[PDB]
Amino acid sequence: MIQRTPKIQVYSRHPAENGKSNFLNCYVSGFHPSDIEVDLLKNGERIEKVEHSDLSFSKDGSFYLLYYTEFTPTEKDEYACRVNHVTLSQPKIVKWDRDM
């Protein structure tokens, strides 16, 4: 009896170049149970095109699922992955690691 929390790994796929498209990699690993709500956002708005990989087993019971958009960073931007889950419940606004 132990509930595994989603480990946040919200990194830049492409380099964070001003006024040029960039894919987010909200790589959410180890969410038990599988019933997660990764409702990722852009500058406050909701992304009605959540592209999702596979609920894949890292080592039989740890789900490494990528939730990737393609956002257009301007300059004074602020993208964020929304990580709600049965463990967390609350709106956990992850701050995208562009400074990486």
Side-chain angles (χ1 to χ4, degrees):
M1 181 175 159
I2 179 64
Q3 66 202 134
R4 287 68 166 72
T5 59
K7 175 175 174 182
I8 62 180
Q9 294 181 243
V10 189
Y11 63 91
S12 321
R13 175 60 173 176
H14 288 251
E17 185 180 317
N18 299 86
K20 182 178 178 293
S21 299
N22 185 302
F23 286 76
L24 194 74
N25 280 21
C26 185
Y27 180 85
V28 188
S29 57
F31 50 97
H32 283 259
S34 60
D35 188 72
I36 195 168
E37 298 176 289
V38 187
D39 184 66
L40 72 164
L41 308 177
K42 51 181 292 304
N43 318 102
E45 305 177 292
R46 176 158 58 173
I47 305 190
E48 197 65 65
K49 189 193 291 182
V50 183
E51 308 183 70
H52 56 264
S53 57
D54 291 280
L55 188 92
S56 299
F57 299 86
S58 175
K59 52 174 172 181
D60 184 67
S62 42
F63 315 140
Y64 66 102
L65 209 171
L66 185 74
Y67 294 95
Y68 62 99
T69 187
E70 185 179 15
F71 64 92
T72 301
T74 56
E75 177 182 90
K76 194 183 177 295
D77 58 74
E78 56 294 290
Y79 304 89
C81 193
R82 176 64 164 266
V83 188
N84 292 77
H85 184 226
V86 189
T87 65
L88 298 177
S89 192
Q90 293 183 345
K92 201 294 192 299
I93 312 305
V94 185
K95 298 178 176 58
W96 166 49
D97 302 279
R98 79 294 189 188
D99 186 66
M100 180 61 194

